[PDB]
């Protein structure tokens, strides 16, 4: 009774039985180095080139130009999206000269921005990388949990797709750094990374109201993810 | 002696009436010189947030005196305020 | 068309909330010594010139400029004839230099808009401006 | 001489006989107009502006006295110069659809570009005289 939307990322949309739940959220969580950017590039990349549906890239840490050939490491030129105007990074990352707090704030300016972009680009599909980052940006940890649920309210009100890519502390522990677990709840995706071989996996933990292969698949980086052995 | 600059907020919240206020009386009291301060809305204006890299409201963005510089908060820690408008160390 | 997007701009960019302000009457244009008058007029001019040589091209930002001019034309409140003034003689400039080029001088109409650009932004400094 | 030049001239003339500044009446605002005195509003400054673009260029006409009687509109309304470009834009899309419909060059639209500096110039004249000075 929910419907998703395909990601085309290679056997993906079989273990999640079709891909991911449309106007929603799914937390993309995993250590450093598990391949959640790879994701979050690979899943607005294919809305675009497959389906023609703009994507919004929403970069926390990473600057536009890192993400850009951060992605050629990948296999994937940007820059050209970018050039036909079907995809937009928006530069949410801190500004190198240093941002002095001096009293109580909220993130109303980034949910009006992000909204302003979707629908200046007419996007329907947003990758947010990496919402942990934030919270090491500045220190008051329960407004920035609070401004993430309303982001991810409005995103959803917009009826938009969203993928939120979120760092951990090991495979085996937490789901995602700082709680947001326990606001961006019902989708959530683990990413493994451990070993004589590195050996890489897929894990969709939670799809709440809805289907899904339970349990660890393994999957290569290639050109792109590639999940395997799962019938 | 010149101050050029731009405070974003967020409709009519507390904390950006307040920064607003603070700001304000600074300038006009304890701040010598020329000054132009330019209010914006950024639930009325997102573009000119884009522009500006602008994440967290309110944002206090310091054209002059040189160089560049942000500051967030409703700004009740008005020190971090007079250092940046160079009326105290 | 270029006129649908500076009209979708000046949208974007304009109708603040409002400007707080503070100037000095020493400064303004008419009461500058003979050498602080055109030493400002000589800023306005290179500004304005960056400006429009940069605005139709893709990738620079040339609202910060504008907003220098601006911020700069109202401090000193300058006449917003003495910046059509500017507009004048730089695109005299720029035709006897079209000349010796023998190309069109069709361009130069374009840069009307830049004009339009810049005398918006200063008058709506005014418009929104909390006297007092 | 050139139009543009003349326009010009035409605004340092000016110069001479405005007040000082102004003061205005906050009620009489188009922010604080009903929704049908909005579009009273709006539609007299577009019958306006269209008479000033079509007798703009005319020499034997006052555009001068309706380039003021606009511009002293917008004004005392606080009509800002983006809703002036706005009415310009609208006036200039219905021109274009009339002028390919008779087959005429489109490129008589840019010397109205012109008539549009000319009010606006006018307009923003008030604006910089909106405030106290000296």
Same mark, same amino acid.
């Given at each position: 009774?929910?419907?998703?939307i395909p990601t085309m990322?290679?056997?993906?949309?079989?273990?999640?039985?079709?891909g991911? *739940?449309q106007?929603?959220?799914?937390?993309?969580?995993?250590?450093?180095?598990?391949?959640?950017?790879?994701? +979050?590039?690979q899943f607005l990349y294919n809305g675009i080139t497959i389906f023609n549906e703009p994507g919004i890239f929403?970069?926390?840490?990473?600057?536009?130009?890192?993400?850009?050939?951060?992605?050629?490491?990948?296999?994937w030129?940007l820059?050209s999206l970018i050039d036909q105007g079907k995809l937009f990074? =928006?530069?949410?990352?801190?500004?190198?000269?240093?941002?002095?707090? @001096?009293?109580?704030?909220?993130?109303?300016?980034?949910?009006?921005?992000?909204?302003?972009?979707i629908?200046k680009y007419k996007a329907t599909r947003v990758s947010?990388?990496?919402?942990? @980052?934030?919270?090491?940006?500045?220190? +008051?940890?329960?407004?920035?949990?609070?401004? /993430?649920?309303?982001?991810?309210?409005?995103?959803?009100?917009?009826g938009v797709t969203?993928?939120?890519?979120? $760092?951990?502390?090991?495979?085996?522990?937490?789901?995602?750094?700082?709680?947001?677990?326990?606001?961006?709840?019902?989708?959530?995706?683990?990413?493994?990374?451990? =070993?004589?071989?590195?050996?890489? !996996?897929?894990?969709? =933990?939670?799809?709440?109201?809805?289907?899904?292969? %339970?349990?660890?698949?393994?999957?290569?980086?290639?050109?792109? /993810?590639?999940?395997?052995?799962?019938? | 002696?010149?101050?050029?600059?731009?405070?974003?907020?967020?409709?009519?919240?507390?904390?950006?009436?307040?920064?607003? %206020?603070?700001?304000?009386?600074?300038?006009?009291?304890?701040?010598?010189?020329?000054?132009?301060?330019?209010? /914006?809305?950024?639930?009325?204006?997102?573009? &000119?947030? $884009?522009?500006?890299?602008?994440? +967290?409201?309110?944002?206090?963005? %310091?054209?002059? *005196?040189?160089?560049?510089?942000?500051?967030?908060?409703?700004?009740?820690?008005?020190?971090?305020?007079?250092?940046?408008?160079?009326?105290?160390? | 068309?270029?006129?649908?997007?500076?009209?979708?701009?000046?949208?974007?960019?304009?109708?603040?909330?409002?400007?707080?302000?503070?100037?000095?009457? +020493?400064?303004?244009?008419?009461?500058?010594? *003979?050498?602080?008058?055109?030493?400002?007029?000589?800023?306005?001019?290179?500004?304005?010139?960056?400006?429009?040589?940069?605005?139709?091209?893709?990738?620079?930002?040339?609202?910060?400029?504008?907003?220098?001019?601006?911020?700069?034309?109202?401090?000193?409140?300058?006449?917003?004839?003495?910046?059509?003034?500017?507009?004048?003689?730089?695109?005299?400039?720029?035709?006897?230099?079209?000349?010796?080029?023998?190309?069109?001088?069709?361009? &130069?109409?374009?840069?009307?808009? !830049?004009?339009?650009?810049?005398?918006?932004?200063?008058?709506?400094?005014?418009?929104?401006?909390? *006297?007092?």
């Amino acid at each position: 009774e929910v419907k998703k939307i395909p990601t085309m990322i290679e056997g993906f949309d079989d273990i999640s039985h079709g891909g991911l *739940p449309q106007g929603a959220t799914t937390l993309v969580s995993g250590t450093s180095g598990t391949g959640k950017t790879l994701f +979050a590039v690979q899943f607005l990349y294919n809305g675009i080139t497959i389906f023609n549906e703009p994507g919004i890239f929403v970069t926390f840490e990473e600057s536009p130009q890192d993400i850009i050939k951060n992605a050629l490491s990948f296999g994937w030129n940007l820059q050209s999206l970018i050039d036909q105007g079907k995809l937009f990074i =928006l530069d949410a990352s801190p500004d190198p000269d240093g941002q002095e707090v @001096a009293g109580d704030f909220d993130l109303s300016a980034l949910i009006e921005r992000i909204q302003y972009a979707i629908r200046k680009y007419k996007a329907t599909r947003v990758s947010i990388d990496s919402v942990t @980052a934030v919270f090491q940006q500045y220190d +008051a940890a329960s407004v920035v949990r609070r401004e /993430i649920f309303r982001l991810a309210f409005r995103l959803a009100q917009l009826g938009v797709t969203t993928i939120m890519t979120t $760092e951990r502390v090991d495979e085996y522990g937490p789901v995602a750094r700082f709680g947001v677990e326990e606001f961006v709840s019902d989708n959530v995706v683990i990413l493994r990374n451990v =070993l004589e071989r590195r050996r890489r !996996t897929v894990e969709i =933990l939670k799809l709440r109201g809805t289907t899904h292969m %339970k349990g660890e698949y393994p999957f290569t980086i290639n050109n792109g /993810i590639n999940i395997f052995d799962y019938k | 002696k010149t101050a050029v600059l731009k405070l974003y907020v967020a409709g009519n919240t507390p904390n950006s009436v307040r920064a607003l %206020k603070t700001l304000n009386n600074i300038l006009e009291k304890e701040f010598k010189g020329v000054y132009a301060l330019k209010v /914006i809305d950024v639930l009325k204006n997102p573009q &000119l947030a $884009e522009e500006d890299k602008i994440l +967290a409201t309110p944002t206090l963005a %310091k054209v002059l *005196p040189p160089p560049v510089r942000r500051i967030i908060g409703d700004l009740s820690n008005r020190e971090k305020v007079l250092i940046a408008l160079r009326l105290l160390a | 068309d270029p006129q649908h997007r500076l009209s979708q701009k000046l949208k974007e960019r304009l109708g603040y909330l409002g400007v707080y302000y503070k100037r000095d009457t +020493a400064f303004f244009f008419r009461r500058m010594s *003979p050498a602080d008058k055109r030493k400002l007029l000589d800023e306005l001019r290179s500004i304005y010139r960056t400006i429009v040589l940069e605005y139709f091209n893709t990738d620079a930002k040339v609202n910060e400029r504008i907003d220098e001019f601006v911020s700069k034309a109202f401090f000193a409140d300058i006449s917003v004839s003495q910046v059509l003034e500017i507009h004048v003689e730089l695109m005299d400039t720029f035709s006897k230099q079209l000349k010796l080029e023998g190309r069109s001088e069709d361009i &130069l109409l374009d840069y009307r808009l !830049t004009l339009i650009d810049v005398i918006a932004h200063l008058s709506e400094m005014y418009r929104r401006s909390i *006297p007092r």
